[PDB]
Design an enzyme around this catalytic site. Structure first.
Site, short mmCIF file in Angstrom:
data_model
loop_
_atom_site.label_atom_id
_atom_site.label_comp_id
_atom_site.label_asym_id
_atom_site.label_seq_id
_atom_site.Cartn_x
_atom_site.Cartn_y
_atom_site.Cartn_z
CG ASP A 83 17.67 21.98 -53.41
OD1 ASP A 83 16.66 22.65 -53.66
OD2 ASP A 83 17.73 21.15 -52.47
CD1 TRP A 98 10.05 22.55 -52.35
CD2 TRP A 98 9.15 20.83 -53.42
NE1 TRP A 98 10.84 21.47 -52.10
CE2 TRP A 98 10.32 20.40 -52.77
CE3 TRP A 98 8.44 19.92 -54.18
CZ2 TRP A 98 10.78 19.09 -52.86
CZ3 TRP A 98 8.90 18.62 -54.29
CH2 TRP A 98 10.05 18.21 -53.63
CG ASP A 149 14.10 25.72 -60.38
OD1 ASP A 149 13.01 25.55 -59.80
OD2 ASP A 149 15.19 25.83 -59.74
CG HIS A 159 15.38 22.39 -58.68
ND1 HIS A 159 15.66 23.57 -58.03
CD2 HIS A 159 15.70 21.39 -57.81
CE1 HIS A 159 16.09 23.30 -56.80
NE2 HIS A 159 16.11 21.98 -56.64
#
Length: 297
Positions: free
Chosen positions: A123, A163, A249, A278
């Site tokens: 991320d 998101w 994810d 994720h």
């Protein structure tokens, strides 16, 4: 700069995370703020694994991968970004920018005199960590890359935008509930560890702002740095590389990662972790073992 600090009693109970806290104060440009990090293993290790977390996690997320790294003779260093984990947390959302986080990371490395690392990222740990070679070309000597993107001024996807809007629509984002949705098998005690940093909405300014500052149009802050970083990985990088992708994810998953694979010079085919989502480090013990075996360790 206004900030809050999470009480220490929030961090008492934590599953598989007995690691002593270490702190840095007086970082240049963050005078006032205290940063927490995990530091385990011998401090003259041949290999230091710099484990960077993202949104809205902290060093806790590396707890299954860390013992594999230390088992191999490694040092593991895992900082909590400001706004996260046991680090202090600015209360004004507007302070959290791409540069705020990147500079923290650079100040952090300089303070520990870490000059050579196996970068382990996922991320925002990868959005930021993957740009470190733009400034520090010899810093990364190996890469373990998980569910992430090089943010170059495009959207990662339809899933990303939903998101982002959802976070924008959640003034008091329940982090533990989000992790429960996102991580197969997560126990209640592990959920509370992700809630632990955030006793209330005033603690979540960095959690709120993160998705909004991913550079997804060409002229947002950090986009050009992203483009520079892609240039490095595509045309200058020649270190050992291992990629793992958590298959479940629906934002930064197999799709986005296959493209990144091809953009990282020498990156072999990804390990697909069907158990993982994720936050693939939650199913990351096999990732760490496979990385090490690939690196000849």
């Amino acid at each position: 700069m206004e900030f809050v600090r999470t009480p220490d009693d929030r961090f008492a109970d934590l599953p598989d995370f007995p690691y002593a806290p270490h702190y840095l104060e007086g970082l240049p440009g963050f005078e006032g703020l205290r940063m927490h990090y995990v530091d385990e293993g011998p401090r003259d290790a041949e290999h230091t694994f710099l484990c960077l977390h993202g949104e809205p996690s902290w060093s806790f997320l590396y707890r299954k991968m860390l013992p594999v790294f230390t088992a191999a003779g490694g040092r593991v260093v895992a900082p909590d970004l400001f706004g996260f984990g046991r680090s202090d947390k600015p209360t004004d959302d507007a302070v959290y920018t791409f540069g705020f986080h990147r500079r923290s990371l650079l100040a952090f490395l300089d303070a520990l005199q870490l000059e050579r690392v196996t970068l382990v990222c996922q991320d925002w740990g990868g959005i930021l960590g993957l740009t470190l070679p733009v400034d520090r070309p010899q810093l990364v000597d190996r890469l373990i890359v998980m569910n992430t993107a090089l943010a170059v001024g495009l959207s990662p996807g339809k899933g990303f935008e939903s998101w982002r809007d959802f976070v924008a629509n959640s003034p008091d984002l329940d982090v533990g509930k989000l992790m429960q949705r996102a991580i197969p098998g997560i126990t209640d005690a592990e959920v509370a560890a992700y809630d632990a940093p955030f006793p209330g909405p005033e603690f979540k300014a960095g959690v709120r702002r993160f998705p909004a500052i991913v550079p997804i149009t060409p002229d947002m802050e950090g986009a050009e740095i992203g483009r520079q970083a892609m240039s490095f990985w595509s045309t200058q990088w020649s270190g050992p590389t291992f990629m793992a992708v958590g298959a479940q994810d629906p934002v930064l998953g197999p799709e986005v990662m296959g493209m990144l694979r091809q953009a990282i010079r020498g990156c072999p085919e990804p390990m697909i972790v069907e158990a993982g989502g994720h936050f693939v480090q939650e199913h990351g013990e096999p990732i760490a073992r496979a990385a090490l075996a690939a690196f000849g360790q």
